[PDB]
Amino acid sequence: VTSYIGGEGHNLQEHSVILIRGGRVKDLPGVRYHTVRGALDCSGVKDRKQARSKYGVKRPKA
Amino acid sequence: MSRYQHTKGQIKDNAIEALLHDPLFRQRVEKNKKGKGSYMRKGKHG
Amino acid sequence: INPVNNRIQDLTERSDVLRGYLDYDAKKERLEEVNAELEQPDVWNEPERAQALGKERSSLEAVVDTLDQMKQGLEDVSGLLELAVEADDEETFNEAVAELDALEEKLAQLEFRRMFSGEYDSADCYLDIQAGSGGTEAQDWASMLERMYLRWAESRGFKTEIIEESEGEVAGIKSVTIKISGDYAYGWLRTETGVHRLVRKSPFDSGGRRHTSFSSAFVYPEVDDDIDIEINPADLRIDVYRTSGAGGQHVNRTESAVRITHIPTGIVTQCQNDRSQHKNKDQAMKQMKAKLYELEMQKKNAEKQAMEDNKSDIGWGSQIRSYVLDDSRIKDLRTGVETRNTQAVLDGSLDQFIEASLKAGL
RNA sequence: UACCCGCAGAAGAAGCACCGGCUAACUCCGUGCCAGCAGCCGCGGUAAUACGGAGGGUGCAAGCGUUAAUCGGAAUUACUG
RNA sequence: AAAUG
RNA sequence: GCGGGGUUGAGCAGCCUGGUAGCUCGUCGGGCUCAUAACCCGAAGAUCGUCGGUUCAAAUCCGGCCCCCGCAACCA
Ligand SMILES: [Mg+2]
Ligand SMILES: [Mg+2]
Ligand SMILES: [Mg+2]
Ligand SMILES: [Mg+2]
Ligand SMILES: [Mg+2]
Ligand SMILES: [Mg+2]
Ligand SMILES: [Mg+2]
Ligand SMILES: [Mg+2]
Ligand SMILES: [Mg+2]
Ligand SMILES: [Mg+2]
Helix (H) or strand (E) holding C24: helix C24-39
Dist. CA C269–CA C289, nearest whole Å: 9
The CA C242 to ligand 10 mean position distance, Å, reads 68
**3-state class of C62 per DSSP?**
helix
Selection from C148, C202, C174, C142 nearest residue C325 by Cα: C202
Distances (CA, A) of C324 to C174, C255, C342, C344: 21, 76, 8, 13
CB C170 under 7 Å to nucleic chain F? yes
Measured CA angle at C319 (ends C183, A43), to 5 deg: 130
Contact partners, residue C307, CB within 8 Å, separation at least 6: B15
Resolution in Å equals 3.0
* CA C238 – CA C124 distance, rounded (Å): 44
Nucleic acid strand F within 7 Å of C266 CB? no
Please name the nucleotide lying closest to C210, CA to C1': D45
Dihedrals φ, ψ of C208, to 5°? 70, 35
Nearest to C220 by CA among C298, C120, C145: C120
- Is residue A27 classed exposed, middle or buried when 0-12, 13-18 and 19+ CB atoms within 10 A define those classes? exposed
Long-range contacts of A48-52 (CB under 8 A, 24+ apart): A48/A7
- Which of C140, C141, C195, C308 is best to mutate for the B interface (most B CBs within 10 A)? C308
Amino acid (one-letter) located at C136: T
Give me ligand 8 centre to Cα C281, in Å: 48
Cα angle C336, C342, C345; round to 5: 80
CA dist A8 to A15, A26, A55, C309, Å? 21, 18, 10, 27
Cβ–Cβ < 8 Å for C138, C45:
no
Q: How was this structure determined?
A: cryo-EM
Sign of torsion over alpha carbons A25, A28, A34, A37? negative
- C partners (3+ CB pairs within 8 A) are B
- The residue type found at C9 is Q
Distance CA C211, CA B29 (A): 5
Rounded to 5 degrees, φ, ψ at C193 are -55, 130
E strands present in C134-284: 159-167, 173-181, 194-201, 210-221, 236-241, 257-262, 268-271
User: A7 — phi, psi (to 5°)?
Assistant: 85, 155
- The answer to whether C216 faces chain B, any CB pair under 8 Å, is yes
CA dist C300 → C128, C288, C310 (Å)? 20, 18, 16
User: Which DSSP state fits B8?
Assistant: T
Distance CA C116, CA C273 (A): 56
Q: What's the CA–C1' distance between C301 and F53, in Å?
A: 48
